[PDB]
Amino acid sequence: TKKKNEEINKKSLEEDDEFEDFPIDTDDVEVDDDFTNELKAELDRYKRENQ
Amino acid sequence: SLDDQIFVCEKSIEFAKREKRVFLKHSLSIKLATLHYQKKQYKDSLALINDLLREFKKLDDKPSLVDVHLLESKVYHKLRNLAKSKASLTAARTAANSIYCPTQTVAE
Amino acid sequence: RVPNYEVSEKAFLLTQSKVSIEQRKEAAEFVLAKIKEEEMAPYYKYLCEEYDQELYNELCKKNESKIKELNEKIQKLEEDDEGELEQAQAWINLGEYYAQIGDKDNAEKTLGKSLSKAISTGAKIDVMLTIARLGFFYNDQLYVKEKLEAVNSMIEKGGDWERRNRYKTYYGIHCLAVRNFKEAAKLLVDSLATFTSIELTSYESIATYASVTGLFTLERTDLKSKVIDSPELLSLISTTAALQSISSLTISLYASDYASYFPYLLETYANVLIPCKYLNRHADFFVREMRRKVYAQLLESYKTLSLKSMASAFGVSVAFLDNDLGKFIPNKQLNCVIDRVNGIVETNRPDNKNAQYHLLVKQGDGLLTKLQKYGAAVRLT
Amino acid sequence: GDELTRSHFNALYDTLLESNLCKIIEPFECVEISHISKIIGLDTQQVEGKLSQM
Amino acid sequence: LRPGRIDRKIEFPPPSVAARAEILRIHSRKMNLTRGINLRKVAEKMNGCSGADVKGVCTEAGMYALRERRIHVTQEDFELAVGKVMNKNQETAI
């Protein structure tokens, strides 16, 4: 009840919230290397045979 | 070889459980587990012992059923689990507490 | 109870188009008879999209037959004198049917009444578990989690050793289901030692899961003892295909075969990781680790390597290997660089003093922020 | 023909390898692997691979 | 041993076979349940003279199961447990 004057006034300067404006308007990064690996193996194998 | 041994075993076992009584029968199942073993069919051999084992613990007091327990150890030896080669060696030993067994049974 | 998982696992292969068209339609033959037989329409409605009204007339008939049978059976056994126990068993029996048609909603209700009534203490523990089983059927991770706590609440009050064995395997599946495998590898190998099955998913599943999780978590020396020299896994031999693929990958790594190692990775992905519903999620996550591991060992042993020696051992080209290596290097589990110019792979691998310095200072920063957090508030108050 | 023989002979390889090796690395630092391979009597390549395990 | 001077004298009988079964039951629960209920099989075989004899079976049954690392308490475990205990008692009391 003490912070409440301050938190509400603080909020007012951001204006609204942005968070609910957003839907109205509208290997964490890596990619799985099994797919890549598959292709590559075939490609190696050819050259290897004819070596 | 392979052919002769397996077919012969089949015809003989069948004849000997429908004519001849239960005594003879449980013996030819030990032989059959042994004879499977020599072909390197070990799954087959282990299931043969399972078929016996419970009903013939009742009956175990014989030197011919001490051998069932020796054989079990060998099955598990070749599948490479030495937890259960160890356990069944123990089993054999309990039923072979009398040391008055055939020399061949002692040697094994 | 038993068939509900059987269905869905088949159905999964039908759903996916990743699977080969030949395999897809093997699954199609098998599942179709059981849809009709076990009357699986509520669950089946989701999947049918997702890959007769007779099924329903049947549902509704069955619903009503099975529904009515069980109804008046209880009406019969309210009368017949034994008020705690016989109503309870009859209420369980309604739930048996619900669990049969794969509607979890109705299962929960009837087994609720079962619990209210005060019966054998073992029995209750069995019921709580049955509800947690239904979480694996839907394969909603969130459903399995909440429920397994209620089971764990009653287990230790019950002090049941017997259903305590079941707990392990179910909790294996939650930790398997999730990414975090550190808790999963320990749990699933203990259950190979002690199996107690009363209405439970096959023993085969447990084998498949131990092997994967063994590989991901454990170091070299402990992999040998616990997985390779597992007596059960060896005694069961490689019979089933799924089990077989993972076993070849395990041996080669340890025997330090490098040539067939990379082909087994491709094999494992085709036949183990993708058919499984729980480790489909973690197919990408498993592989990335295992490619780092073959390298991580190899760099331990070698100050320098050539690119051609490194590449060729595995059976991949120099161009392909170099690319795969720059992916892994910034995660800092390999601690090596590639000299393009000299063509060597030099190994930094720092275990120096300066290395150990980093690990303790990062713990100290965590403690620093918290002190400020508690103190500043409490001082204002 | 002897499975039991073959297993312990795999072990023998490694144990007597060590007994040789502990002598070798004492009076040397930065010894060529060519030189090491002569002392043991094994193939050059074969030496390389075994050490990677040790 | 003047009578009514020690004013009560109490003899405890050597256990009944039913009395034995109740002791056997509760300590098994502490271990793990006897599979295929072989709690009766022991009582049918022998009646102890004391509750110690009963305890001896328990500890032993749980001991074969320990080695194995298979919590189950099997018929095979019980049968060993009893005979082992039974020998011992006879070799003291002959």
Q: Which residue of D has its CA nearest to C297?
A: D52
C234 at interface of B, judged by CB pairs closer than 8 A: yes
Burial string for C90-115 (b: 16+ CB within 10 Å, else e) reads: bbbbbbbbbbbbbbbebbeebbebbb
CA distance B74 to B88: 9
Residue C118 and residue C84 in contact, taking contact as beta carbons nearer than 8 Å:
yes
Within chain B, residue ranges assigned H as helices are 2-14, 22-37, 43-57, 63-78, 83-95, 103-107
Beta-bridge partner residues of C304: C346
A28 CB burial (10 A radius; 0-12, 13-18, 19+)? exposed
Going by the DSSP 8-state scheme, the letter that residue E12 receives in this structure is P
Q: Which two tokens stand for residue C108?
A: 């929960």
3-state secondary structure of E9: coil
Helix/strand/coil (H, E, C) string of E14-77? CCCHHHHHHHHHHHHHHCCCECCCCHHHHHHHCCCCCHHHHHHHHHHHHHHHHHHCCCCECHHH
Cα angle: C122, vertex C123, C128; to 5 degrees: 100
DSSP state of B21: -
Q: Which of residues 146-165 of C touch E (CB under 8 A)?
A: 161-162, 165
Nearest to B65 by CA among B48, B77, B75, B53: B53
> Which chains are within 8 Å of A by 3+ CB pairs?
C
Task: Give the integer Cα–Cα distance in Å for C329 and C337.
Answer: 8
Query: Is there a contact between A33 and C324 (Cβ–Cβ < 8 Å)?
Result: yes
How many other C-beta atoms are found inside a 10 Å radius of the C-beta of residue E88? 12
Test A37 with C262 for CB contact under 8 angstroms: yes
Q: How far is B45 from chain E (nearest CA, A)?
A: 22
Distance CA C161, CA B65 (A): 35
Could you tell me if E31 and E62 are in contact, meaning their C-beta atoms sit under 8 angstroms apart? yes
CA distances for E69 relative to B15, B69, C225, E28, E64, angstroms:
43, 21, 16, 17, 9
Enumerate chain A positions whose Cβ falls within 8 A of a Cβ in C: 27, 30, 32-34, 36-38, 40-41, 43-45, 47-48
The Cα C330–Cα B44 span in angstroms is: 53
Instruction: Supply φ then ψ for residue C347, to 5 degrees.
Output: -120, 120
The answer to whether A and C touch (≥3 CB pairs < 8 Å) is yes
> Sign of dihedral through CA atoms C38, C43, C45, C50?
negative
Angle, helix D3-24 to helix D33-40, in steps of 10 degrees: 130
* Structural contact between residues C169 and C191, judged by C-beta atoms closer than 8 angstroms: yes
- DSSP for A3-48, please give it: THHHHHHHHHHH-S-STTTHHHH---SS--HHHHHHHHHHHHHHHH
DSSP H or E segment with residue E90:
helix E75-93
Tell me the backbone φ, ψ of residue C163, rounded to 5 degrees. Answer: -85, -10
| Cα of E57 to nearest chain B Cα, Å | 17
Cross-strand partners of C347 = C336
Question: What is the spatial distance between Cα C170 and Cα C176, in angstroms, rounded to a whole number?
Answer: 10
CA distances to B82, C229, C327, C377, D17 from D12, in Å: 21, 20, 41, 69, 8
User: SS3 of B28, please?
Assistant: helix
* Nearest alpha-carbon partner for D33 in D23, D44, D42: D44
CB C227 within 8 A of CB C214: yes
Q: What is the C-alpha separation between B74 and B71, in angstroms, rounded?
A: 5
Spell out a b/e string for C47-71, using b for 16 or more CB atoms within 10 Å of the CB, else e: beeeeeeebeebbeebbeebbeebe
Distance from C-alpha of D4 to C-alpha of E77, rounded to nearest angstrom: 33
Contact C301 D49 (CB under 8 A): no
Q: In what order do the strands lie in the sheet with C304-306?
A: C304-306, C344-347, C336-338
Is the minimum CB–CB distance between C221 and chain D shorter than 8 Å? no
Which token pair is A16?
């609204």
State the nearest Cα–Cα gap between D52 and chain C, in angstroms.
5
How would you classify residue E32: left for phi > 0, otherwise alpha for psi between -120 and 50, otherwise beta?
beta
Q: C90: which residues sit within 8 A by CB, 6+ positions away?
A: C70, C73, C74, C77
Taking each helix axis as running N to C, give the angle between helix C203-217 and helix C164-177, from 0 to 180 degrees, rounded to the nearest 10. 50
Contact between C126 and C104 (Cβ < 8 Å): no
How far is C-alpha C129 from the chain's CA centre? 17
C253: left (phi over 0), alpha (psi -120 to 50) or beta: alpha
Phi-psi region of C194 (alpha: psi -120 to 50; beta: other; left: phi over 0): beta
Bridge partner list, C345: C305, C338
Query: How far is C346 from C338, CA to CA, in rounded Å?
Result: 6
Answer whether A touches B (≥3 Cβ pairs < 8 Å): no
Does C302 reach chain D within 8 Å, measured CB to CB?
yes
Please say whether the beta carbons of C242 and C272 come within 8 A: yes
Residue found under tokens 């193996």: A41
CB C58, CB C36: distance < 8 Å:
yes
Handedness of CA B10, B11, B14, B16 (dihedral sign): negative
Interface check E66 vs C, CB under 8 A: no
**3-state SS, one letter per residue, for B78-94:** HCCCCHHHHHHHHHHHH
Read off the tokens for C274: 């993708």
E chain contacts of residue C193, beta-carbon cutoff 8 Å: 69-70
Tokens of E85: 């205990």
Cβ pair E68:B94 closer than 8 A? no
**Residue A10 is encoded by which pair of tokens?**
């603080």
- Method used to solve the structure: cryo-EM
Q: Can you state the angle between helices B43-57 and B22-37, rounded to 10 degrees?
A: 150
Distance CA C120, CA C111 (A): 14
| One-letter-per-residue 3-state SS of chain C | CCHHHHHHHHHHHHHCCCCCHHHHHHHHHHHHHHHHHHCCHHHHHHHHHHCCHHHHHHHHHHHHHHHHHHHHHHHHHHHCCCCCCHHHHHHHHHHHHHHHHCCHHHHHHHHHHHHHCCCCHHHHHHHHHHHHHHHHHHCCHHHHHHHHHHHHHHHHHHCCCCCHHHHHHHHHHHHHHCCCCHHHHHHHHHHHHCCCCCCCCCHHHHHHHHHHHHHHHCCHHHHHHHHHCCHHHHHCCCCCHHHHHHHHHHHHHHHCCCCCHHHHHHHHHHHHHCCCCCCCCCHHHHHHHHHHHHHHHHHHHCCEEEHHHHHHHHCCCHHHHHHHHHHHHHHCCCCEEECCCCCEEEECCCCCHHHHHHHHHHHHHHHHHHHHHHHHHHHHC
Q: Are C319 and C332 in contact (CB under 8 A)?
A: no
Q: What is the DSSP letter of B106?
A: H
Chains E and D touch (3+ CB pairs under 8 A): no
Chain A residues whose beta carbon lies within 8 Å of the beta carbon of residue C263: 41
Binding partners of C (≥3 Cβ pairs within 8 A): A, B, D, E
Which of D44, D45, D40 lies closest to D14, judged by CA? D40
Closest alpha carbon to C213 in C188, C195, C193, C238? C188
Please tell me which residue of chain C has the smallest CA distance to E68.
C193
Task: Tokens for C341, please give them.
Answer: 């110019």
Question: Closest approach of chain B CAs to the CA of E36, in angstroms?
Answer: 13
CA distance C156 to C170: 16
Residues of chain E in contact with residue B57, where contact means CB-CB under 8 angstroms, are 76
Q: Is the dihedral of CA B13, B16, B22, B25 positive or negative?
A: negative
The vertex-C100 CA angle with C79 and C65, nearest 5°, equals 50
Please name the member of C269, C291, C317 whose beta carbon is closest to the beta carbon of A44.
C317
Chain D residues touching residue C298 (CB < 8 angstroms) = 52
CB of C304 within 8 Å of a chain D CB? The answer is no
Neighbouring CB atoms inside 10 A of B33's CB total 25
Task: Work out the burial of residue C165: count CB atoms within 10 Å of its CB; fewer than 13 is exposed, 13-18 middle, 19 or more buried.
Answer: buried
Residues on chain C touching E74 (C-beta within 8 angstroms): none
Whole-angstrom distance, CA of residue C172 vs CA of residue C214:
13
| CA atoms of B84 and B71, how far apart (whole Å) | 12
| CB proximity E86 to B under 8 Å | no
Crossing angle of helices C86-101 and C104-116, in 10° steps, is: 170
B49, B74, B80, B85, best to mutate vs chain C, most C CBs in 10 Å: B80
d(CA A19, CA C185) in angstroms, rounded, equals 41
